[PDB]
């Protein structure tokens, strides 16, 4: 019950599913054959949330994979933990979008959307108690941000009361992979905030940097990154599939974290995490967790968490410990960071504890809070989008694909205004 569907799209959303799914199976010890060989009774009590029952006693995840070009699809199955996916669910095209936002949202996707979209009802109707839809996609991939974003609008059009999860990775300005990174984001953002109830930002620059400063791993690999991507993701519902002192489903975290309908952006954090060298030296302490999960470098985005004021905080504690130890630890930091803590709403920090920690760890906590600091990011991307706009650069493709600059113009107008309005409350005082 309280189940949500897994939807991974675009090139940046695929491997995470190739990795996120692996993690879950390890979380429930689900063997590569889809047959349960776990150790604890609690392991399976709520497996319907992410795993369904099939004939013969095997399990198949309830995820729908898609893309405009089959090559990326032709890779997930060859990877470890691919035998769980159902062969029928795959839907693929023949040409691709080529990092062209207009192609994935105006011409190509419109015809192919139904086939991939169609399977939504067959699944969404399949749920015993739908909780929401979680989307893992990147605004930096033209095929993704074009095809991926539209599905949200159609998806939302049928279940308005539902609450939706989106995990989008915006290419940080520090490192760029496709010269058209600015374009596809700006128009995507305009639609993105149009439907999404929740959202999470992630920058690769912040992603690998934590590896170089904290993890210090010798040779980073995307696979190492994916393990980083889900780890924080894995905590999203960890409290949703097992009991706890104060059960925390997906919705209530939504209720406690979005002060206004329009200002619904957060940053996250995952702990514990350290380099291989000191794997034994430190001592796992809640005070150790609280400082780190309040450590700025622990943030998943390049934006400095100390560069703004925290709208609110949410604590998802993994593992056991005394309840009182939860409350005192949180309050002290707010007092020691009052200048960093807004005064509109006292106790803007949410504390919940999960009784089933990650495998191989005793105490774990993922940080989630709405930080105004996001006002920098929307400035940089737009400035990158704005500055190159004046030269009419690369503009003829979307204009030649049925879309007009007015659609280009409208995006920033709803982009820059949201930038100020988010920062408008920053200078407000009681």
């Amino acid at each position: 019950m309280r189940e949500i569907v897994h939807i991974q799209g675009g090139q940046c959303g695929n491997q995470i599913g190739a990795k996120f799914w692996e993690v879950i199976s390890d979380e429930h010890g689900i063997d590569p054959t889809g047959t349960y060989h776990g150790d604890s009774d609690l392991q399976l009590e709520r497996i319907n949330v992410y795993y369904n029952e099939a004939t013969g006693g095997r399990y198949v995840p309830r995820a729908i994979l898609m893309d405009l070009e089959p090559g990326t699809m032709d890779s997930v199955r060859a990877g470890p933990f691919g035998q769980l996916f159902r062969p029928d669910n795959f839907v693929f095209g023949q040409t691709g979008a080529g990092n062209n936002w207009a192609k994935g949202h105006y011409t190509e996707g419109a015809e192919l959307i139904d086939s991939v979209l169609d399977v939504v009802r067959k699944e969404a109707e399949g749920c015993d108690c739908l909780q929401g839809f979680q989307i893992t996609h990147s605004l930096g991939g033209g095929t993704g941000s074009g095809m991926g974003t539209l599905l949200i609008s159609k998806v939302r059009e049928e279940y308005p009361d539902r609450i939706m999860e989106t995990f989008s990775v915006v290419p940080s300005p520090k490192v760029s992979d496709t010269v058209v990174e600015p374009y596809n984001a700006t128009l995507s953002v305009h639609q993105l905030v149009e439907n999404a109830d929740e959202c999470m930002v992630i920058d690769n620059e912040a992603l690998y940097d934590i590896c170089f400063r904290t993890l210090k791993l010798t040779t980073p690999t995307y696979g190492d990154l994916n393990h980083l991507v889900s780890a924080a993701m894995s905590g999203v519902t960890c409290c949703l599939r097992f009991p706890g002192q104060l059960n925390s489903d997906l919705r209530k975290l939504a209720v406690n974290l979005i002060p206004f309908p329009r200002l619904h952006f957060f940053m996250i954090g995952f702990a514990p995490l350290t380099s291989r060298g000191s794997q034994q030296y430190r001592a796992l302490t809640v005070p150790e967790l609280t400082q780190q999960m309040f450590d700025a470098k622990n943030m998943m985005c390049a934006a400095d968490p100390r560069h703004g004021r925290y709208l609110t905080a949410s604590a998802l504690f993994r593992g056991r410990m005394s309840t009182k130890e939860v409350d005192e630890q949180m309050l002290n930091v707010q007092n020691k960071n009052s200048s960093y803590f807004v005064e509109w709403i006292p106790n803007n920090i949410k504390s919940s504890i999960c009784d089933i920690p990650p495998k191989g760890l005793k105490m774990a906590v993922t940080f989630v809070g709405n930080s105004t600091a996001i006002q920098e990011m929307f400035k940089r991307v737009a400035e990158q989008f704005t500055a190159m706009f004046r030269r009419k650069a690369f503009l003829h493709w979307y204009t030649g694909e049925g879309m007009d600059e007015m659609e280009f113009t409208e995006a920033e107008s709803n982009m820059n205004d949201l930038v100020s309005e988010y920062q408008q409350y920053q200078d407000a005082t009681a």
């Binding site: 063997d31 590569p32 604890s40 009774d41 060859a78």
Partner: protein
């Protein structure tokens, strides 16, 4: 004088491919906690080796029945020791020092003149080429990813195979130059983790093990792969290891519990078999039939190919035995506590009788009760459970007895009440009732966990064992009279000497301190090794002798009349934890801390 051993009960399959039937058989090597023991099949005689510090990490035997080699894992600062051992001489030949913690495994070339070792996940997985005749550092080079094992080619020692974590690289070694060659196999649309190696005898093709459970095909001629594996079926935890039959048929045992064979043709299992536990070792005897199989749960099984009917030889305690007990005035059957489960074992012959197991809990101080009632234990959760001897079902549950779990339990002569040990400085008594179970313990105050509890014949008074020492004798009737024999150490097991107010006790310090009911000391034994602490003691029915086992590998039994020893124990590894005497007193049995069970014939001139 040492103490005679009449049998050894114990086995560990943690180190892969531990079992191997010696070429021509009659010899087999199975790693104990830290020592190597070789046993004869036709005859029951066996030889012992004890020249090692830490536990074994890998064991393998060179072809043609020459000397053996292996490796182990020590602490990070120190370096693992190499395990070159001869054959037909039973004498240590060479010793080497290198590597940080542990090396994955060893395997010799076709000739007995080359040796190579691959370091653990530490040391960047250092691989070095060693000389069989004498110790030298020929040459070596590192590797970026972790290689979990290496096996040399049946022929043409110049070329070997190593199945690295992310890629299977064929390494080439040339004598002319010290360098080592590396070529990368290409697997487009492949991301599989691999575990085992199997080079075909022809040396052209070979096969390996995978975590998914599918066996790939790769010939040494070129890195390209050829096949997929058993279509439409997987073993649910990959491949533990692989072996090659004379016909080429591949016999595989899924660690999930399965024995399967894939023939060299479109691979459809002709026959299947699943054995309890997780397969760990696959070895072929002479004339190629009835291979030897040992699981990960320390199980040894015998099979017949072409119809896989598992047949059990014998298995052993999972690891780190907890305690021993004997039936009142009875020694035919003895039981013990394991890390998660309990078992019932026969004395005359070591064939298992029956068992009582708990899912994810560890127990302490398993004891038997008079009148067959019953097998009672308090578990990590603190609950107290009792089971019937005939079948593994519980009689009554006493839950939430201790916050940090039970620690002690014994038997009252009338057993109308129970006596236990509390870790949080508590001792709780229970006047059991058949209709319901209730407690009336005073809930006393104590600094440390109670490590033992004793009941005298008249069962009024009682002596309490402690970690902070605090040897507080409880009146057990009024729940008062807190007077404790003094010592500023961490005591251990304590028992009552027969028909005597003298209490033979041991503490943290290396000394068998004597204390009476009037703070009198007969003598300070001074039984202590360099860093060995005696952890178990007892007294015979007649106050003539007492057998003691310290933290040392030795079994140290002394006479109570005077501090003069008679015989001792040898051949033990780990930290022995308890020593009891059977009611017949014909033998004294103690188990190894690592999961080793040994029985010793007590000296005749003590009855």
């Amino acid at each position: 004088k040492e103490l005679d051993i009449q049998a050894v009960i114990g086995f560990t399959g943690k180190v892969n491919e531990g079992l191997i039937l010696h070429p021509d058989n009659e010899h087999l090597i199975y790693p104990l906690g830290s020592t190597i023991v070789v046993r004869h099949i036709i005859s029951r005689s066996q030889t012992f080796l004890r020249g090692h510090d830490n536990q074994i990490s890998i064991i393998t035997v060179s072809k043609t029945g020459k000397y053996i080699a292996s490796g182990q894992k020590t602490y990070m600062g120190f370096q693992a020791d190499i395990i070159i051992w001869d054959f037909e001489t039973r004498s240590l030949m060479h010793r080497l020092k290198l590597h940080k913690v542990l090396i994955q495994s060893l395997s010799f070339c076709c000739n007995e003149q080359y040796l190579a070792s691959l370091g653990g996940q530490d040391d960047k997985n250092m691989m070095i080429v060693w000389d069989v005749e004498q110790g030298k550092a020929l040459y070596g080079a590192p590797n970026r990813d972790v290689v979990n094992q290496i096996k040399f080619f049946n022929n043409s020692d110049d070329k070997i195979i190593a199945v690295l974590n992310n890629g299977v690289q064929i390494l080439t070694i040339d004598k002319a130059n010290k360098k080592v060659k590396s070529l990368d196999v290409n697997f487009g649309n492949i991301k599989r983790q691999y575990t085992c190696v199997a080079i075909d005898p022809s040396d052209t093709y070979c096969y390996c093990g995978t975590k998914t459970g599918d066996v790939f095909e790769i010939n040494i001629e070129r890195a390209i792969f050829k096949r997929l594996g058993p279509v439409k079926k997987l073993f649910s935890l990959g491949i533990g290891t692989l072996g090659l039959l004379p016909n080429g048929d591949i016999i595989v045992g899924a660690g999930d519990g399965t024995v399967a064979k894939l023939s060299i043709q479109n691979m459809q299992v002709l026959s299947q078999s699943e054995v309890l536990g997780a397969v760990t070792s696959i070895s072929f005897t002479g004339d190629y039939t009835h291979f030897f199989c040992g699981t990960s749960q320390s199980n040894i099984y015998w099979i017949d190919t072409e119809k896989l009917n598992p047949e059990l030889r014998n298995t052993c305690h999972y690891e780190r035995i907890n305690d021993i007990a004997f039936p009142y005035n009875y020694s035919d059957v003895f039981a013990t506590c394991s890390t998660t489960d309990i078992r019932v074992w026969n004395a005359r012959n070591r064939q298992e009788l029956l068992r009582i197991q708990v899912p994810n809990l560890e127990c302490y101080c398993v004891t038997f009760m008079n009148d067959g009632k019953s097998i009672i234990s308090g578990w990590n959760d603190g609950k107290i459970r009792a089971f019937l001897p005939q079948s593994g079902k519980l009689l009554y549950v006493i839950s939430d007895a201790h916050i940090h779990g039970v620690t002690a339990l014994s038997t009252t002569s009338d057993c109308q009440r129970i006596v236990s040990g509390g870790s949080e400085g508590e001792v709780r008594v229970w006047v059991i009732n058949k209709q319901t179970q209730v407690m009336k313990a005073s809930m006393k105050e104590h600094r440390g966990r109670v490590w033992s509890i004793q009941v005298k014949k008249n069962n009024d008074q009682a002596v309490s064992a402690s970690a902070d020492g605090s040897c507080i004798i409880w009146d057990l009737k009024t729940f008062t009279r807190l007077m404790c024999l003094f010592e500023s150490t961490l005591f251990k097991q304590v028992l009552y000497h027969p028909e005597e107010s003298q209490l033979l006790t041991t503490g943290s310090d290396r000394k068998i301190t004597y204390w009476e009911i009037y703070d009198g000391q007969a003598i300070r034994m001074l039984d202590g090794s360099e860093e060995g602490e005696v952890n178990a003691l007892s007294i015979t029915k007649e106050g003539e002798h007492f057998v003691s086992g310290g933290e040392d590998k030795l079994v140290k039994l002394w006479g109570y009349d005077e501090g003069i020893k008679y015989y001792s124990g040898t051949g033990h590894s780990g930290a022995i934890t308890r020593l009891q005497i059977s009611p017949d007193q014909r033998t004294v049995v103690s188990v190894g801390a690592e999961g080793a069970i040994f029985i010793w014939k007590m000296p005749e001139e003590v009855v």
